[PDB]
Amino acid sequence: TYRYDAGTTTFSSDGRILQVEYAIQSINQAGTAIGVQFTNGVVLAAEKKNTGRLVDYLFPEKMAKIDGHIVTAVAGLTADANTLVDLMRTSAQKYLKTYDEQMPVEQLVRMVCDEKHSYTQYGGLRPYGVSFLIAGYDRHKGCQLYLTDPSGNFGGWKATAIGENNQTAQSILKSQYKDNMTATEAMDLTVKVLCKTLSADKLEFAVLQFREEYGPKVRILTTSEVDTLMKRY
Amino acid sequence: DRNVNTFSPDGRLLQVEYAIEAVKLGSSAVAILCPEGVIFAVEKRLSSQLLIASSVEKVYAIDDHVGVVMAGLAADGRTMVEHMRVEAQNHRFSFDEPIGIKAVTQSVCDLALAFGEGQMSRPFGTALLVAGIENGKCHLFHTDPSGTYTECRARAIGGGSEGAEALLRDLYKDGMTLHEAEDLALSTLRQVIQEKLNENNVEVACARVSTGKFEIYTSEQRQEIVARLPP
Amino acid sequence: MQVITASGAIVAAKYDGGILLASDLSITYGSMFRHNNVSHFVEVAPNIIIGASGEFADFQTLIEVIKSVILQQQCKHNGEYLTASEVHNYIKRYMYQCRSNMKPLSCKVIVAGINPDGSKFLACTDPYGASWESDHIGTGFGKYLQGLQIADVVNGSFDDVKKGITEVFRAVNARNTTANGKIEFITVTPQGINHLAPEQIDPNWEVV
Amino acid sequence: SKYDENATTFSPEGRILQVENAMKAVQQGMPTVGLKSKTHAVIAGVMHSPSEFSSHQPKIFKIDQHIGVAISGLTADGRGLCKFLRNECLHHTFCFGTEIRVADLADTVALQSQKKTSKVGKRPYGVGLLMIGAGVDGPRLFETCPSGQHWEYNAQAIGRRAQAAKTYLETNLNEFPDCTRDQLIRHALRALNDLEAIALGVVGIDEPFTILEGPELQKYID
Amino acid sequence: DSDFSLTTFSSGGKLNQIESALKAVSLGGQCVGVKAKNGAVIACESKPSSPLVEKVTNLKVQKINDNVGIVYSGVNTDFHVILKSLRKASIKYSLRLGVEMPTREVVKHAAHKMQYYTQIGGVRPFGVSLLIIGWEELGPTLWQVDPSGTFWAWKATALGKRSDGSRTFLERRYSEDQSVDDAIHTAISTLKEGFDGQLTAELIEIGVVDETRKFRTLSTAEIRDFLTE
Amino acid sequence: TTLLAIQCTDGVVMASDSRTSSGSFIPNRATNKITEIQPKIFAARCGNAADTQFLARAVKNYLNALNITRENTDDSTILVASNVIRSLIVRYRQYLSAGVIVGGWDSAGPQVYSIEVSGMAIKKKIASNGSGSTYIQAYIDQNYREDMTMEEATKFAIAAVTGAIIRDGSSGGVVNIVQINADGAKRMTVRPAQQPFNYDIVKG
Amino acid sequence: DYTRSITRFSPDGRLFQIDHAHAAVQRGTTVVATRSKDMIVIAVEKTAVAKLQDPHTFSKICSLDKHVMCAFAGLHADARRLIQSGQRQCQSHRLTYEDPISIENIARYIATLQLKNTQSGGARPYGVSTLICGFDDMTSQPHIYETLPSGTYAEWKARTIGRHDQTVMEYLEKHYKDDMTDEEAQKLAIGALLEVVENGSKNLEVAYMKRGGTMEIMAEEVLDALIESTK
Amino acid sequence: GSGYDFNPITFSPDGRQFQVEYATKAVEKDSLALGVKCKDGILLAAEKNLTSTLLTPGGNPRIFWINDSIACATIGHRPDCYSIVEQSRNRAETFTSNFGIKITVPQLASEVSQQFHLAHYYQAYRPFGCTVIFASYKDDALYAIEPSGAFYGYFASCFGKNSNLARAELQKTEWKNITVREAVPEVARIIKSLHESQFKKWEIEMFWLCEETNGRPQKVPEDVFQSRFV
Amino acid sequence: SSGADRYLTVFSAEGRLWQVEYSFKAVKQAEVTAVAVKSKNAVCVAVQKKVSDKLIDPSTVTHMYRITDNVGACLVGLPSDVNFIVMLLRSFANNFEYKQGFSIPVSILAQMLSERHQLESQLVYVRPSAVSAILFGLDGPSDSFALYKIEPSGYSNGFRAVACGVKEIEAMSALEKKMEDFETPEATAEFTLSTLQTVCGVDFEAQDVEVSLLTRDNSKFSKLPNDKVNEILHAVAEK
């Protein structure tokens, strides 16, 4: 009967999928996740959703390694973000299995975004209320950072920010982001943006770095590493 | 709110009636059947001069002998045309004969009510005029979104359908010639449109008994009909 | 087409008053005389009996199917039974569908009935779904050990058709290894189906 | 009104308002009359005329060699039901080799429409049938309704103007049983006031179902 | 049709069915968790509907596998669904990999199932929040999984009735260097604060992952000893 | 295997050997070939132990299914068990190679139904199955009496299964007897020492 | 599976979901496709990109095949799905038929995807208008089909989609010529987009497919030269 | 029901299934059908208020064949009545297919109440606006399934218009102490007494499953009882 | 806010499944009360038997049901839902016996019913089955009388004594106030019927109540015949 159906995959008078717009709002009310693309790699830095003196910072709530060459930061619902992270990991491994090559970052982004968009356009199910900052490396586009939203729309960003106070982080990145940054410089910029738009415990970091011989490596900074990075700032 | 399959308290399928309205919003098309064949004349609504008129097609050759002209949603009419072409070629394959005009019209109409909810989501927003040659006899049918095909001798579908019917009521006769059928179709189209009728804004076609073929008129033939028109 | 538990020969033949079917009441497991007093015929309608020669498990499957279909049509038609023609048509279709599904019923099925129009209907569907209507049908060694005894008297008096069927089943008892027991006779007449007393049809044993 | 949204929703008075809306669709169809005799059945229908230059859209259809249906309501629903009826006839002939009975076809149509009303998302057939068939069960006339029920009638009138035809049939009801095929056709034509718009399909215990229109019907128009 | 999500974003970007399921959790019976240095504890108020209830027949503190145990606050029946799913997932994990499902993997599976029911159509979210305790390489780990499928680790927690006051009480009374004994005492104390009337051993269930890495549900006798110690 | 179900006036006597044969090896010499479908429905099993045990399992399942929607659990249960075994043997005719004598007691009294490996279900007062039953056919014919009581039928069934045991390599061991009357089923085991005769009747 | 009738006729005969998909297209960025006898030029306005946004490999322009360029206006993910289907279809046409898919055929396929979404229960319409252009063969005239969210498609001498479609289309009509050269078509598209872009060099991108060639993005230097020549 | 009467699977705040009792109202609107378990058999009478005099007198059955031994009187929404009749025939046929025996009216009643219950238990279905009285003399069973699916065996069942007065009258007669042949006059008396004068032409479709029919569902011969009334 | 929470089994703003509680109300609409007492030596369930007509066959108006030969189920609630849960419990027991090879325990059957009620209270397209099920019987593996009560919510718990129906609250109060470790099955049956009679407020006759007293001598489920029920009722009236 669809009496209580919300018509999730239905346009609104303005031509917007209301469920996708509300998912975007949910993201904008979530912890800030900033991505900064430096010379060889990308620094992702997210605000943990679940913090407090009684919370145990054992795992990255928002940072999720997708593959040896791709890491992600989450803004919004960490649950459906985890679902899409599982799908992204499976897609990267399927690409590796098919081609014996690490999935190009844009293809993994396209896959997760096609999942999101399939939820926005078919099935009458709510969209994934998560925005991903997918940092990655591939031989084609070098090191990349992609911002993906619940609509399934993604774009490459040298630097960007999502979540709470994402506009302030974006403005700070515009003011201070420079090309050809070093890993240290980009980490400092991300820490500065996070602090200016918001504590090491609450914050989590992940540096993708491409070395010529070692390849692309994802390193999600632990509590102690993030504490050291914050104290450096 | 209510399902697309809802019957109104009057007993009308609300979505079918709304699809008929969508047809009423479509380009005017007039089919005139004469003992010498049947003629489609459809308005091509050239919104811009950069619009390729040849690509804006209401007339579709379903088969060598039968064709259709659309009024309403061009894409839904395209789906109906695809079904009709598949069914005309399937009939040619299954029975080694051209599909009957009634047969292909009924085939496309059986798809009209196939919409549902809880298949298509909605009725077709296009009405068809299916004119063809079956066993050397010219047949013409009109189908509405309800899936109700009725054989016609002179029908009009689209923007000026009511006005075209009023004009044909005292302009169409059962013993006209092919030239007279062309003149009547083109005149009815001109009088039930909001633009001038030239070889570019009109698409003409004929299911001709003489050739037993549904041929869509070239620019020269449309120019000839336009020139011969008295006004 | 595997026949482990086999119903033996059937000899049906039209006579003036109906169809006289005959068959031993024995099911043979291989060459063994396994079961006795097992009617190879099942009355499926008041004027329609069905017998089968060959796999009796397949005959039971078929009889269950026929009875289910007859019950369905009785529900549709206020208890009115399918005609012998309709029942045989369904048996033909079912057995051909089973041969086309590659799970054929290894039983030659005889449908002997009286159609509502009073016409004697004697038809037979082989395990392959090949079916035919005859005035007399032999299945198993009732077909082979038959000669002209039935053809010469088919549609004759009940006594003549009974005598011819008795000759055929004397041949069957003499020359069929799976022939065991008395030969039950069944008259499908417009007045119903009558199971005549089974007869021990003895081969002439003065031959020794 | 609020209960009139689905064929699955009963109203507080135990009614399916969408089924009644499909019924009203049928009632707004062209007049259709059916008559039954001991040996013949007839369905005469005033075929709809959407325009003066449109041949009257056929409503008297040929289903089985001895069954014909007059569809009143949504023509496309009637055509889908006729495809279903052809499937049932084909399967009955396949299974038993005999022509299905019009009573069995009426039962199948009733079941199909009842299914269309017992599940959401699917809609009652806007079409109502007058199916006449002369089989082993004799000549039988059935009015199949969108709700999913059929009524066996000696005579019936459905669609618009049906009241006058129904009254006329009631007046001559007791005559119909013994009336000859020609007499039955004449009764159908009288009961069904519009000539060319009137088709008339007649079936008999012996004769197959055949449709007469205009000239073929003139001998009985009287 | 069924497969339309009844958990959908509202105008404010909030899944209102998620908040409703969290409310169902908040009326679902106080359950506490406390991470010790050498283990973790999941206690919970298990006040039976009647004394005639047989406690062992429906226990809120449950074992998912040898190393992972689970308590819940919320709807008992869909907690049992989640628990069957988690035990099945850990058995599948052992079949595939020869070891019990890791604590974090059990938590991620519970979170995935809850998120699934938050997104698929025809279903409501699970009205339970799970406190899953188990060991990992770095030490004991208490985890909370919400009806939304969002999971996160805790040092101490309360989920059910009066869980805000219980969480404040844990903030005040929880310490990092607690032993499993002290974690059990802290969980019992938190239950006492979140429970009115005499808090006895039969009214609470305690599960513990201790130095041995194995989850065990303390019997009523052990709970009595802890209450009297 | 030897199976011999006798429907007596006062009950059903289902006798069998206990020998499962794997070629010339007896993996199970104390085989219970008469499976208890229900307290008074038993399935003497002949053929592939896997197939016949699946048939017993599936007929228990089908008899429980029969009782999902009814309260007269004791009605037509032997007949339904036979019908179900027949349907399973026919349906799995390619796969299953199994013949079941389903005998016992229900509301309809004592009933024995032999479902042959072909899937031919027949109600019998004396049903026999298995390679060993062959050797006792004439014996049964000359020693079975329709008037045998459950005691007389039990003695006769023990003697017949003992003859089949002696003569059949595939039949051997004890005689598993099930006596099903209205009051229930009693199981007996006639070990070779208690059997009426042994190998010494062969040529003597 | 979800099969709600998302797209249904309104009482006035309009598919409001198609209207909302058109609104989504309008909120999409402007594309202009222009044709010279031996060239097809698609100029798309780059969305306002900050200094922090990578401007490479995110153009709205795409190649459905070595002979088929595509550009879109509207929801980027809807258009991504359409482009994926269109590329799969071009390869599928090559598989089924050795011939490359005709621009009419591929434009029909994409418009039929949009039509199916307007007809499929539980499927939102594609909020995407697609300018699908290319050459059927070496000797075939360049084609520029525009497929709308409604699933209708029409060939155009020059067309625009997205925001400012009115203004860009007016510019095209004022400045279109029957036999424009490659340079003239490039200038037409570039100026048509220049009228409604805050910056010429930055906000504007161009991709041209010459006869017997593949999709080719304009060099920034050559694009700037053409922009300055237009101004 | 303040919105609790549109979805069949929706309970009222009081636990009422409003769609189910609307189906029950559909049953109540229909002409009364009553079964009586007699000593010689079971007699299913069904009042047929012929709306049109043109209806075939020997047609429009309210009582249907389910088996060679099971009849089904129907009350309420005739489409649902015949849908349930065909589903009961299918249930009996499937029962024979599974178990090889004929279903019993109690078991058929359970299996068909399964479908009744599915109507208002799973979404997307409509409650069956019908009560079905299955009578079998072989089973000595007279089980009525109500639209909810609540099925009960009856000594004398009755549903439809004036079914309360009909039940009261059926109480006055010890049907198991009388035969179906001598129960026919009593049942016809009850139906005629409770019959509404709004219909001048009407019938009493009377089936019986008795020793005379060998338990078969047989419409009572017109010689025994003339169903036609004017 | 949409009203799905009050018509479907989705949580309300208070996190309550309104349809589940309305199915509790529908259970109470059965107008009968069931009291089950499980002692060490027996489990007696007594559910008052109300027949609305004299023309309804009383044997068909039952709330005791054989699930398995061992497990009985006293189902209180909507008669259609009661029949559905009877057949569902029987199917659960049959599937369990087929997969596992032994008769389903009362505890596992209760858990399976709880899972069905959980899928009803979670799947919005499935109604909560308005049945309070008192599953009972002698579990052989423990050789002890299991007595589980499963609510329409699916809340399943083993009980030393439980009640369902209209007077479930009063019956539960009486049970938890006067329960004992009764020494004999006769004592258990007397207490069960006395509690039911007291809470119902009507002196019962055997016809007016169905009693299933599963003892170790008779562990198979069966409704006690009216003579044994009358003897129990006389014993109750004896004190």
Side-chain angles (χ1 to χ4, degrees), chain D residues 35-41 134-135 137-140 154 175-180 184 204-205:
Chain D
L35 285 92
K36 202 195 78 165
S37 64
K38 296 271 203 175
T39 76
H40 280 86
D137 50 338
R140 298 180 77 176
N154 289 335
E175 284 76 317
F176 303 156
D178 304 317
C179 283
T180 300
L184 213 66
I205 279 177

Side-chain angles (χ1 to χ4, degrees), chain C residues 4-5 27 29 32-36 38 55-58 60-61 64 104-106, chain F residues 83 86-87 90 93 114 116-122 124 128-130 133-134 137:
Chain C
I4 308 93
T5 58
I27 303 301
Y29 185 103
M32 181 193 165
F33 180 12
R34 173 65 94 168
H35 309 293
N36 193 17
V38 187
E55 183 47 65
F56 202 73
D58 290 341
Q60 287 177 337
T61 296
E64 293 164 8
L105 294 196
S106 328
Chain F
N83 295 329
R86 203 198 89 75
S87 294
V90 170
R93 188 176 276 159
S114 185
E116 304 284 331
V117 64
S118 58
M120 177 215 161
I122 172 169
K124 305 209 72 55
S128 60
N129 224 325
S133 69
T134 311
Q137 290 305 314

Side-chain angles (χ1 to χ4, degrees), chain E:
Chain E
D1 185 301
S2 159
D3 184 75
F4 68 80
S5 180
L6 292 95
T7 298
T8 49
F9 298 87
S10 64
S11 177
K14 302 178 294 184
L15 297 305
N16 294 173
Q17 255 304 300
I18 300 309
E19 313 297 9
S20 302
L22 284 162
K23 207 75 179 60
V25 169
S26 73
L27 54 75
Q30 167 72 180
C31 90
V32 175
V34 181
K35 176 183 157 161
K37 159 168 173 50
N38 57 295
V41 179
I42 45 168
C44 66
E45 179 260 27
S46 294
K47 176 39 156 276
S49 41
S50 70
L52 306 166
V53 173
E54 292 169 352
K55 187 213 192 77
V56 76
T57 64
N58 206 333
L59 295 171
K60 307 194 180 186
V61 162
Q62 299 282 15
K63 186 184 77 62
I64 291 172
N65 58 66
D66 295 334
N67 304 94
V68 183
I70 186 172
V71 70
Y72 80 104
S73 287
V75 171
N76 175 247
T77 338
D78 72 46
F79 160 69
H80 286 307
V81 156
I82 286 287
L83 172 74
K84 289 253 288 182
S85 192
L86 282 180
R87 289 167 168 166
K88 185 184 172 66
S90 177
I91 251 67
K92 205 219 85 64
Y93 188 102
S94 309
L95 288 166
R96 179 168 182 258
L97 300 168
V99 285
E100 299 288 42
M101 200 181 224
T103 311
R104 203 170 303 193
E105 296 305 314
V106 168
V107 174
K108 278 146 61 76
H109 189 280
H112 157 68
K113 180 162 190 70
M114 291 209 186
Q115 191 283 325
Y116 189 69
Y117 277 72
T118 67
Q119 199 155 32
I120 53 152
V123 309
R124 54 165 186 75
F126 288 99
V128 296
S129 289
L130 328 168
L131 286 190
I132 298 166
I133 54 160
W135 271 78
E136 317 194 39
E137 186 207 354
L138 283 74
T141 63
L142 166 68
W143 297 85
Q144 179 181 345
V145 188
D146 275 6
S148 28
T150 177
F151 69 94
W152 62 105
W154 277 105
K155 303 176 179 290
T157 322
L159 302 189
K161 294 196 302 176
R162 328 213 300 193
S163 55
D164 189 7
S166 286
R167 272 180 277 107
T168 300
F169 169 84
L170 289 164
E171 272 272 13
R172 166 169 46 265
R173 198 208 159 289
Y174 172 85
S175 49
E176 297 284 16
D177 64 326
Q178 290 184 142
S179 62
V180 154
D181 193 83
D182 279 60
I184 295 162
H185 285 294
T186 305
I188 288 169
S189 307
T190 310
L191 293 177
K192 285 187 173 190
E193 307 323 315
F195 173 74
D196 286 314
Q198 183 63 2
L199 183 285
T200 74
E202 298 80 29
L203 302 197
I204 64 184
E205 301 164 35
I206 306 182
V208 184
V209 295
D210 52 74
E211 316 91 48
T212 65
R213 308 301 196 92
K214 300 291 167 300
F215 175 78
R216 65 169 202 288
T217 307
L218 307 191
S219 67
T220 300
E222 307 171 77
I223 302 175
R224 285 199 218 93
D225 306 354
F226 274 104
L227 285 160
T228 64
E229 284 164 353

Side-chain angles (χ1 to χ4, degrees), chain C residues 146-167:
Chain C
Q146 195 164 51
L148 274 302
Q149 284 101 331
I150 315 296
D152 288 355
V153 303
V154 69
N155 306 311
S157 66
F158 169 83
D159 277 12
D160 291 349
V161 169
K162 185 82 152 55
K163 191 272 193 67
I165 291 181
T166 293
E167 303 200 81

